[PDB]
């Protein structure tokens, strides 16, 4: 809370106004490196907390390995998706539709990039996943970083990395839900349309991609 006064060549008094302290600290904190780091870390903490609540989530990579039980895989998927739903908006906390889910075991299903595949017919919404490649994706995570509860950074790495692709899938599901098969297919031909469609999305909260760049050499972008 502040005020301001000004005067002129003439004796004709002055102009006055007030200005509000809050905004300035607000903005400096909005640029306060530590603040944003805390935000992202808090998000990850929330997710891992939900994992702990989820039947005390067991060791990740082997739990995904071994073809032991589809049940835990499906539960992981569902819970992560609901978590993303809630983060992007707690306003509509969940979604009813029950369904089974597909695991597939063969390269012959390979979809480049996309590991996870939404589908529907006859009102039965469904999604499908090729474990093997994802297992490979998780496995071997040197994470060199060269340059009491056993909570190592290592598996936390995978715990984060999953979230990225799951978010990527959440985009496609949202698109299909709003617009159905035609837009969904036309989009999953090419992700490039996403922003041009979602320009409306002044959502209250922000995506993970804070680091603001993911680029490599210009060469070979040939006409």
């Amino acid at each position: 809370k502040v005020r301001t006064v000004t005067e002129i060549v003439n004796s004709d008094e002055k102009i006055q106004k007030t200005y509000e302290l809050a905004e300035f600290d607000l903005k400096n904190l909005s640029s306060l490196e530590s603040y944003e780091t805390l935000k992202i870390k808090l998000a990850l903490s929330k997710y891992m907390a939900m994992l702990s609540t989820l039947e005390m989530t067991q060791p990740l990579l082997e739990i995904f390995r071994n073809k032991a039980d589809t049940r835990q895989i499906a539960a992981v998927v569902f819970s992560t998706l609901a978590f993303i739903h809630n983060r992007f908006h707690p306003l509509v906390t969940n979604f009813t539709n029950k369904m089974e889910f597909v695991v597939t075991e063969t390269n012959d299903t390979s979809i480049p990039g996309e590991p996870i595949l939404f589908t529907e017919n006859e009102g039965v919404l469904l999604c499908s996943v090729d474990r093997p490649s994802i297992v490979k994706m998780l496995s071997r995570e040197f994470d060199t970083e060269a340059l009491d509860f056993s909570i190592t950074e290592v598996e936390a790495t995978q715990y984060l990395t999953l979230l990225l692709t799951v978010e990527h899938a959440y985009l496609h599901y949202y698109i299909f839900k709003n617009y159905g098969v035609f837009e969904y297919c036309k989009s999953l031909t090419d992700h490039s349309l996403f922003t041009n469609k979602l320009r409306s999305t002044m959502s209250t909260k922000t995506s993970n991609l804070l680091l603001s760049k993911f680029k490599f050499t210009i060469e070979d972008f040939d006409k």
């Binding site: 780091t37 870390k41 903490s45 929330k46 891992m48 907390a49 939900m50 609540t53 039947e55 049940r71 819970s79 906390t93 969940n94 369904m99 889910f101 597939t104 390269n107 012959d108 299903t109 390979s110 979809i111 480049p112 595949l117 589908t119 469904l126 499908s128 994706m137 496995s139 071997r140 040197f142 060199t144 970083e145 340059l147 509860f149 909570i151 950074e153 936390a156 790495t157 984060l160 990395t161 990225l164 692709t165 031909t189 090419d190 992700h191 490039s192 996403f194 922003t195 999305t201 002044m202 922000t206 995506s207 991609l209 804070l210 680091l211 603001s212 993911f214 060469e219 070979d220 972008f221």
Partner: protein
Amino acid sequence: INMRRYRNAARKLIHHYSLNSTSSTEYKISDVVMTMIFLLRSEKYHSLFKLLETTFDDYTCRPQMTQVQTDTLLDAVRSLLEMPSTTIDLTTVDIMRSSFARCFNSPIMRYAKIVLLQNVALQRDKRTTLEELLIERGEKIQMLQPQQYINSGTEIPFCDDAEFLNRLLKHIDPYPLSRMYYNAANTMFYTTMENYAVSNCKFNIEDYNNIFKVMENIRKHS
């Protein structure tokens, strides 16, 4: 004859060409030479050494190993990576071999020629296309019922004690940040192009270029 040092370089080279090559500037022609010398010394691995030296634009009469010999070769491979948790398909190794063929066919000098490409050497004499992905299709998915659904651990859980979770957070604070991404996210989901192992439909920089124009919106619209 520092067989030890030579091996030590070699293993790094193996990982660098195979998978999860988090390293940087691993390449060194002297080091790969030490690798070849180590191979020669490795009488037990002479099979692989001769296979590797064979890399030239001829390659008629490939090794044609019996499956037993291939299995012993994979045993060597795992014993020499000393990270045996998986046996990779031979085809990845042959692809690294094709990369080595590129290395041979290279009068390339002080110029900083980063390879800057995914090698196209996975082919099986087939052609592939993006709309043809729709023809790869989920007919198989239609041929499979999803395994199951059940209500157990049912419905909508929520978060635990903030204070306990801060207790846990304190273990996370020490760790570095964004290097985790630069390792895992970068490497892994770049190399996901491996999926083109299915008759190598070409990669397309274009949609990967989504990333900047899509993430920018956060800052662009506050």
